[PDB]
Amino acid sequence: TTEIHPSCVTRQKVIGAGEFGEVYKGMLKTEVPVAIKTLKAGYTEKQRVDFLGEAGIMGQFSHHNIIRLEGVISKYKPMMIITEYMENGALDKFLREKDGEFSVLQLVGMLRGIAAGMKYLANMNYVHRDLAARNILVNSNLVCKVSDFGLPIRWTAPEAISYRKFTSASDVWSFGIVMWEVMTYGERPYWELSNHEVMKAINDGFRLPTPMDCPSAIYQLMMQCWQQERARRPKFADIVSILDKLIRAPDSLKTLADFDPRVSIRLP
Ligand SMILES: Cc1ccc(C(=O)Nc2cccc(Cl)c2)cc1Nc1nc(-c2cccnc2)nc2c1cnn2C
Numbered sequence: 001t002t003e004i005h006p007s008c009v010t011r012q013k014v015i016g017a018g019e020f021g022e023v024y025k026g027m028l029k030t031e032v033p034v035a036i037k038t039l040k041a042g043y044t045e046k047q048r049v050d051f052l053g054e055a056g057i058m059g060q061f062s063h064h065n066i067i068r069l070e071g072v073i074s075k076y077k078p079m080m081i082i083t084e085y086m087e088n089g090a091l092d093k094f095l096r097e098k099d100g101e102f103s104v105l106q107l108v109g110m111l112r113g114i115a116a117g118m119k120y121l122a123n124m125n126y127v128h129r130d131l132a133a134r135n136i137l138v139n140s141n142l143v144c145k146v147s148d149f150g151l152p153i154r155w156t157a158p159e160a161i162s163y164r165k166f167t168s169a170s171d172v173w174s175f176g177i178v179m180w181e182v183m184t185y186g187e188r189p190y191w192e193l194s195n196h197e198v199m200k201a202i203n204d205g206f207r208l209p210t211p212m213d214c215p216s217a218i219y220q221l222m223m224q225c226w227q228q229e230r231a232r233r234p235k236f237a238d239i240v241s242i243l244d245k246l247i248r249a250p251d252s253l254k255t256l257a258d259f260d261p262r263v264s265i266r267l268p
Contacts, residue, residue, distance in 0.1 A: 001059040002071035004082060011036055020047045025085060033085035034070055038078040055081050065117030067137060067147040087140050092133035096186035104215060104253050107182050110144050112243040117146040118175060119236035122168035129166045131174035133181040153195040158202060159230055169230045176225025183211040210257040217246055219257040
């Protein structure tokens, strides 16, 4: 893993919490903005194993749609994981703050990138387990980078909830939820339904309705991510292929799925 000397790192502002430390925005020299997760004094053996194991896995990833590791500080305390910094932040907050500001093609392009990152992870035998818009970072080119900030019933496939079966096919279910989050500009999946109500609805066959202004092809694809039978879901290769063909022939996205009105306004 690229070892960074502590003299090259300056922590500026706290931006989150780690499992045994804080997460900071800072600068890296040898300047470049970075995010920094620390492992403070007193960490346990298991925490050190997990922290350095995470750095080791991240160092193996080299893909346009996966967060990039700048390096690690393991020879000095506190230990640190240092990544590139993504100015637009997490995707869920980004879309909620930019409601209605993007074209359908831009939104579908974000999904194509997330799917490409997930295809890479699945091919590398890495099961994400927490794919959601809150774990996807956005850069100033609108490129989405799959990440994992730590701790999701509403995003999780039935088999993963029921018997802890987490696979790339349960990640596909989660990706379908992410597609819905993107197309709705960050709407909470299932709205005010409780966790138990969500699972009951899913087991009874109900699924999230189409977002407003949503291409028919995109809704059909998210629906197939939500098949109860894990083996019937698309693989990420299938998802990337479909999204790539839709974007290439963008008139395909002009056909919209019918939106079910919740409110009726009658005027002359
Ligand atoms: C420092 C750090 C460490 C690990 C990760 C991370 O994504 N790890 C990870 C672990 C397993 C699989 C994958 Cl795909 C990623 C990300 C980051 N970078 C971050 N960047 C950012 C961030 C925030 C705003 C703008 N740019 C980056 N926020 C982070 C984090 C971590 N937590 N939080 C809250």
